Amino acid sequence: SMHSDLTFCEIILMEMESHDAAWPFLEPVNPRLVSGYRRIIKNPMDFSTMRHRLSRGGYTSSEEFAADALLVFDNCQTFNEDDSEVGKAGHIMRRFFESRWEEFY
Numbered sequence: 001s002m003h004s005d006l007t008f009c010e011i012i013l014m015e016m017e018s019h020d021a022a023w024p025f026l027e028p029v030n031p032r033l034v035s036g037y038r039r040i041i042k043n044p045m046d047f048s049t050m051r052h053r054l055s056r057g058g059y060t061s062s063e064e065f066a067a068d069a070l071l072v073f074d075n076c077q078t079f080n081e082d083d084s085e086v087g088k089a090g091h092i093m094r095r096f097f098e099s100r101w102e103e104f105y
């Protein structure tokens with residue numbers, strides 16, 4: 001299970017999941033709702049996957065956790081136009097995360 005040294009990561013993820021711009025990223029990108037995603041995006045990532053991985057002890061380091069958070073936003077800007085609703089949400093959430101991360105590093 002999760003080492004207590006990563007509790008601050010657990011809290012950042014909780015706060016991201018609560019954010020009103022987080023809705024595109026709560027669960028894996030869903031083939032029932034969009035086609036051609038994994039055709040382009042070789043490493044999908046979403047907050048639920050991160051939440052379960054963190055809780056079961058699947059992250060060793062905060063940097064590994066942060067890399068997955070940035071992967072969410074990088075995938076978003078790869079697939080989505082910047083002025084689309086999801087594309088804008090990714091930019092908001094990247095700002096939100098980088099701000100929380102800077103409080104610690």
Ligand SMILES: CCc1c(-c2csc(N3CCN(Cc4cn(CC(N)=O)nn4)CC3)n2)[nH]c(C)c1C(C)=O
Nearest residue numbers: 023024025026029030033034037075076079080086
């Ligand atoms: C656009 C796909 C995408 C999502 C995403 C997550 S979730 C979601 N969608 C939720 C369901 N809606 C329709 C709908 C509305 N309602 C409520 C009602 N009042 O009916 N129910 N279904 C359509 C879009 N898209 N995330 C990412 C990162 C994406 C991409 C391409 O990168």
